[PDB]
Amino acid sequence: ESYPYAITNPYHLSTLATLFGINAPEVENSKILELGCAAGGNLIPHAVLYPNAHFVGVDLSKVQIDEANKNVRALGLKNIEFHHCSITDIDDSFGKFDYIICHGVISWVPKIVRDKIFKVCNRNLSTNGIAYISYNTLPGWNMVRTIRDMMLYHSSSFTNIRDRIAQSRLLLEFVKDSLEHSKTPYAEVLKTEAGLLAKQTDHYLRHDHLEEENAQFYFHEFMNEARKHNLQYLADCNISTMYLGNMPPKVVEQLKAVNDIVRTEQYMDFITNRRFRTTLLCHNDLKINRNINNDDIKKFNIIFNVIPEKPLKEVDLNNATENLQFFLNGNKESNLSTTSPYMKAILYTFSENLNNPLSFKQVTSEANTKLNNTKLNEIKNELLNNAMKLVLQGYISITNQKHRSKPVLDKPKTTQMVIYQAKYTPSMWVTNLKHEPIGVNFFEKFALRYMDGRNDKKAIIEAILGHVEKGELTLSKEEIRKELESLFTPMIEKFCSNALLV
Amino acid sequence: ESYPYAITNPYHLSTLATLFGINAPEVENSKILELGCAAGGNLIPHAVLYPNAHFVGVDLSKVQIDEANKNVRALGLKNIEFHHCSITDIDDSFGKFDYIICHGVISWVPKIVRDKIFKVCNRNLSTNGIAYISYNTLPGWNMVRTIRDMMLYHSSSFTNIRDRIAQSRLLLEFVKDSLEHSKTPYAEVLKTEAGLLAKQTDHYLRHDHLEEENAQFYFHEFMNEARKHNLQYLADCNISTMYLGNMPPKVVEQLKAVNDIVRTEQYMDFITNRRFRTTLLCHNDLKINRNINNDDIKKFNIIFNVIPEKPLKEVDLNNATENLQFFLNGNKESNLSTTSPYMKAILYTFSENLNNPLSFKQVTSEANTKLNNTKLNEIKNELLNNAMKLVLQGYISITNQKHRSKPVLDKPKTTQMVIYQAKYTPSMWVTNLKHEPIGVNFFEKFALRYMDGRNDKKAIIEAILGHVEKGELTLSREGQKIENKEEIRKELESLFTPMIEKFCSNALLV
Numbered sequence A: 001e002s003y004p005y006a007i008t009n010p011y012h013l014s015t016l017a018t019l020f021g022i023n024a025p026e027v028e029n030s031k032i033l034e035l036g037c038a039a040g041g042n043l044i045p046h047a048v049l050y051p052n053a054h055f056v057g058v059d060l061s062k063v064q065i066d067e068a069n070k071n072v073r074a075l076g077l078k079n080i081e082f083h084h085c086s087i088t089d090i091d092d093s094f095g096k097f098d099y100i101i102c103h104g105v106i107s108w109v110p111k112i113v114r115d116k117i118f119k120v121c122n123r124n125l126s127t128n129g130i131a132y133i134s135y136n137t138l139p140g141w142n143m144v145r146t147i148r149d150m151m152l153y154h155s156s157s158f159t160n161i162r163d164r165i166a167q168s169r170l171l172l173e174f175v176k177d178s179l180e181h182s183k184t185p186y187a188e189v190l191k192t193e194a195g196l197l198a199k200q201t202d203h204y205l206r207h208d209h210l211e212e213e214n215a216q217f218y219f220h221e222f223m224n225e226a227r228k229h230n231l232q233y234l235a236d237c238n239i240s241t242m243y244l245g246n247m248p249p250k251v252v253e254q255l256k257a258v259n260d261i262v263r264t265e266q267y268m269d270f271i272t273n274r275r276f277r278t279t280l281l282c283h284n285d286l287k288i289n290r291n292i293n294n295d296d297i298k299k300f301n302i303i304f305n306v307i308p309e310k311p312l313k314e315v316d317l318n319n320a321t322e323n324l325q326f327f328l329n330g331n332k333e334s335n336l337s338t339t340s341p342y343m344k345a346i347l348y349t350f351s352e353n354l355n356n357p358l359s360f361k362q363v364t365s366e367a368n369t370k371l372n373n374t375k376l377n378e379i380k381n382e383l384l385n386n387a388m389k390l391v392l393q394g395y396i397s398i399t400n401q402k403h404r405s406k407p408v409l410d411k412p413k414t415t416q417m418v419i420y421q422a423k424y425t426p427s428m429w430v431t432n433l434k435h436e437p438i439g440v441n442f443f444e445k446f447a448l449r450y451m452d453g454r455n456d457k458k459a460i461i462e463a464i465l466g467h468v469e470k471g472e473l474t475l476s477k478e479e480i481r482k483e484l485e486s487l488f489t490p491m492i493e494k495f496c497s498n499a500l501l502v
Numbered sequence B: 001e002s003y004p005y006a007i008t009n010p011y012h013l014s015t016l017a018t019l020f021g022i023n024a025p026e027v028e029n030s031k032i033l034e035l036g037c038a039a040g041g042n043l044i045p046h047a048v049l050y051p052n053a054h055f056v057g058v059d060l061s062k063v064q065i066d067e068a069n070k071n072v073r074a075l076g077l078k079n080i081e082f083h084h085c086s087i088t089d090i091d092d093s094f095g096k097f098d099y100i101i102c103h104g105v106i107s108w109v110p111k112i113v114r115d116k117i118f119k120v121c122n123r124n125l126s127t128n129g130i131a132y133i134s135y136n137t138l139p140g141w142n143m144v145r146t147i148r149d150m151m152l153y154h155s156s157s158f159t160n161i162r163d164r165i166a167q168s169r170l171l172l173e174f175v176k177d178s179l180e181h182s183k184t185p186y187a188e189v190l191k192t193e194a195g196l197l198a199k200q201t202d203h204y205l206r207h208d209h210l211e212e213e214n215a216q217f218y219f220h221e222f223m224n225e226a227r228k229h230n231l232q233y234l235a236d237c238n239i240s241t242m243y244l245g246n247m248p249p250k251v252v253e254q255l256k257a258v259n260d261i262v263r264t265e266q267y268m269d270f271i272t273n274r275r276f277r278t279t280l281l282c283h284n285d286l287k288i289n290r291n292i293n294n295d296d297i298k299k300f301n302i303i304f305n306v307i308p309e310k311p312l313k314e315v316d317l318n319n320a321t322e323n324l325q326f327f328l329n330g331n332k333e334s335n336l337s338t339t340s341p342y343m344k345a346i347l348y349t350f351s352e353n354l355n356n357p358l359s360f361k362q363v364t365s366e367a368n369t370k371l372n373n374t375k376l377n378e379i380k381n382e383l384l385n386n387a388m389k390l391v392l393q394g395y396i397s398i399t400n401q402k403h404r405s406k407p408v409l410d411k412p413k414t415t416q417m418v419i420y421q422a423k424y425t426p427s428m429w430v431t432n433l434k435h436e437p438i439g440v441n442f443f444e445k446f447a448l449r450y451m452d453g454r455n456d457k458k459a460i461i462e463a464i465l466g467h468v469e470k471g472e473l474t475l476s477r478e479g480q481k482i483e484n485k486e487e488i489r490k491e492l493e494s495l496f497t498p499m500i501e502k503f504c505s506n507a508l509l510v
């Protein structure tokens, strides 16, 4: 189970670099390095997308690297190589990379390897390159460490990994039952954290990992190390963690009064109990511009994943007594509502383009055709006044990736990575065109096996029919017929709006 | 400022020893050692109370030990020694002690000194003696450490201790400002913690104290160190921290099943976020009896400090359907109510005996007089069935201390220690007979100066009046001053009766 992590997508690093006034290299011709890449699930899909780029993963585990290379051979990729070696084996002969991704390693490795990671992110980084390093942080990690301590101390039962996992689990359940009637805040925190741990699979409970030491960085100590290597802080990959606007305005003005972003970020870590950071680093020499304005939205392609409570053909967009509701990435609650004809036209245009970025001009022109082409100015005004605020709060995505051609649904066609995963892989998820893991059931997976752009609906349904009778697939003959076709159109919608169709 | 800590009282250690089947040494002739005694405010009041007991303090700070010796000399005590030396200087020549008190020390000292504290608590402890060691604990200490890390980080502004203090205060208020509207639970925990910290004085916030390393014990790690020295866990001095009865029965059954008290205690620390322990240890070879029965209440004198909502003379206790309310140490917020006439009679009896220990026979016979002396057996049954449960939950105090004879309020007489504190010391608090600091206002402190067991009420009032006229005490009406000789005499006579009640109920009168 080697997952892609969308937040490490080189196009995301490049986007964030653009936001802050850095011109990062074009992704399609770039060179990309992943440190501690495991079996390559966070790297291989990019190699498939960008045959003109070059990819290098490094991991100390020979079994993971062997699995990486097996999938490389299977996909026919000529642009990617995996090396079984330590990070500490990397030297100047590896060359310079435009993007360096190190996700979930630096907290778990000894000091000599942490120092090496910083040194590679300097020496092997291109002039305008971007380095990603993610790590656990105090104060938020305290609670996790406590539970690990708890599970180790009560786990002296037997010697086996397997046997010990079961009593770790029933210790989590025992904790739940213990706190049943407790109203204190700490009981609430511990109960939720234990519930999370219980949900996880055995690889995360296995006690050899529980015993592993975490570096327990504070942000300012991490940055101390990065600055020793002449790297400066660019951004967190979730920019909403940098948002100061939900705080009292005197406080915000005071935070701006001192100008250093590391101290401000550390302060926010202290008062928010921050447990994890996904940090972007770049070379000291670059001049970063943190002054962001509304018009900056025009620099980017935009995604706002919103689902309207009422369909478009049932509403009159110029009826301003009607407050219409849109659910964000979903949904119920966690939502927004508008009375504006212009904001309605904008939100309806985003809801037809889910996970398919639109330029400022594309969004506003398409919304204007819903307003009879008369409103372009008012629409541009409404988007300008709002977009960047919602981006900085994390509701809207910006990307340097371009709008994708509308998929043709007569003969639905998924991607090379996805067809491969559906045919040859046991996992119940696939990697979409945004480098996001998308969960699928058995019906959706078997159906993805057949979307090459050739087979029509009847053909795909028949190919799946080969699978149901000899399972393989079992759906929870005529009932099977229209049960299968009732599942078809919603599946196509899910694939088309989750960037699984080409 | 050197406070007494009532929880370290050797009579409290002895009481807990008795609860668990240990016969600890008689307090009045004992030998008592305090490690890291600072200025001796936790030791000196016992030397005053127990002329036939011997007391030894040890502290590394010359300034503190000098203050302790100044107060010993001021009090004229011959039974107490204060030594300026390290705990590492203690050896077999110091002799054996029946009680050893180490409070707020071991978490703050290097590993070698911690080793030595355990060693002393074995080698210098009498056969039946009790050692007390308190320390900060994980997981609860995480938050405190975090705030200290924050303060040190956010004030690094070179070179000025007072200015660094001002920056740390500014920081803490800035925190409170930042979290105002935010409703998340972490924000609330942090908010009140920084509130406590802002409340304190400058010596707790000085960066050199913030930089000091805490040992950060888990309980099982503390007990591992104690066991190396052949010390076993007796109990926590707040026994309510040991109580499992508020947890689901199946959980309580599993905990009871594992039959390891140190593991059970650790589990409770994890699920309650325990931040501090006050631990009693004793030699490994003593047989500790953990089976506690209702009738064990008969072994102890008892205090339950309850204030009735309604005066006894306004209620009929024999009424069984009326719900009567009682407020604990306090209160009006935290209370206990009952319709039982027998529990009512017991509760009014405790309310008349505040902070004065009562035997089982005393509680039940006095309760019976309220029920017309026909109820003795029912009242004994009520106390039997509820008392030890309330003890283990922390509501009722048990003590090996004797019942004290009633103070005669005619010529009120306070104790040697508090008459010293009131006359000769700047502090606004005094140390009562139970080793508790009791806050006093200016009128109460002045009054205490004059209660020698000779001055009657008229003479005490005349003395205080002299202070009001000398300019050293002012009385607000309020908020206009009351300046006329008569009418200040009037007001003083108004204030005297509740003051004598408060002293009487706070164990300040002999």
Ligand SMILES: Nc1ncnc2c1ncn2[C@@H]1O[C@H](CSCC[C@H](N)C(=O)O)[C@@H](O)[C@H]1O
Residues within 6 Å of the ligand: A002, A003, A035, A036, A037, A038, A058, A059, A060, A061, A064, A085, A086, A087, A088, A103, A104, A105, A108, A109, A113
């Ligand atoms: N010194 C070293 N050099 C190269 N890889 C290392 C290393 N030390 C640890 N690793 C690798 O670092 C990884 C940490 S687990 C994280 C793996 C992957 N990025 C993911 O999130 O799924 C493991 O695959 C381990 O084999």
Ligand SMILES: Nc1ncnc2c1ncn2[C@@H]1O[C@H](CSCC[C@H](N)C(=O)O)[C@@H](O)[C@H]1O
Residues within 6 Å of the ligand: B002, B003, B035, B036, B037, B038, B058, B059, B060, B061, B064, B085, B086, B087, B088, B102, B103, B104, B105, B108, B109, B113
């Ligand atoms: N090695 C050592 N030997 C003797 N005293 C020490 C010591 N290390 C620290 N101390 C003393 O331990 C005390 C810690 S502060 C706690 C003091 C006191 N028990 C109270 O609670 O008020 C300080 O007075 C310090 O001087």
